[PDB]
């Protein structure tokens, strides 16, 4: 009978609501706001896990580590833009060497 199952979500609508009310964002919080926000947070999370999972698989591993979250994000145009000013600790960088620097 939780709000998440009602909205058909895995993310916690109840907590998102409580976090919104106690964060000093507005005097009042509509009932739909935490549902919407929760769904949005869940979707973005699935999107990243999906691509990081693939990055893991392609590395011949079944456990997602930071490197993979970095490879998934930097190799995706939109995720890269959204997290342009964020650093993933222990993520390292994408292999990339300027052409001019190659031998011959």
């Amino acid at each position: 009978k939780t709000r998440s199952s009602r909205a058909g979500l895995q993310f916690p609508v109840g907590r998102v609501h409580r976090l919104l009310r106690k964060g000093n964002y507005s005097e009042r919080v509509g009932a739909g706001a935490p549902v919407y926000l929760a769904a949005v947070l869940e979707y973005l999370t699935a999107e990243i896990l999906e691509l990081a999972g693939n990055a893991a698989r392609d590395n011949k591993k079944t456990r997602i580590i930071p490197r993979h979250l970095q490879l998934a994000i930097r190799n995706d145009e939109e995720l890269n833009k959204l997290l342009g000013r964020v650093t993933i600790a222990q993520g390292g960088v994408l292999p990339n060497i300027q052409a001019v620097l190659l031998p011959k």
């Binding site: 549902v35 979707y43 999972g53 993979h68």
Partner: protein, 93 residues
């Protein structure tokens, strides 16, 4: 005492997309940071939106406009659909 995080939820979502894939502790920390950051950005923008328009309450409408302002193109479209879908399914049964 108690320190709450999104770990249990990120994990449940992990199983949906990759039933056989796991996740290290450090990677889980990254995901927690991510959820908190995006949560703050959306909430922060929704807060300004309502203030600019002299409204005292944040509704799904401010969350939707905030998502539109914060997420790049395709991500916004999908995010917007995922959200109105959850609000309708919640206002029904």
């Amino acid at each position: 005492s108690r320190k709450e995080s999104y770990s249990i939820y990120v994990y449940k979502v992990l199983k949906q997309v990759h039933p056989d894939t796991g996740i290290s502790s450090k990677a889980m920390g990254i995901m927690n940071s991510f959820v908190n950051d995006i949560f703050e950005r959306i909430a922060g923008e929704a807060s300004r939106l309502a203030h600019y328009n002299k409204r005292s309450t944040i509704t799904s409408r401010e969350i939707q406009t905030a998502v539109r302002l914060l997420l790049p193109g395709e991500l916004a479209k999908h995010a917007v659909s995922e959200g109105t879908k959850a609000v309708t399914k919640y206002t029904s049964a």
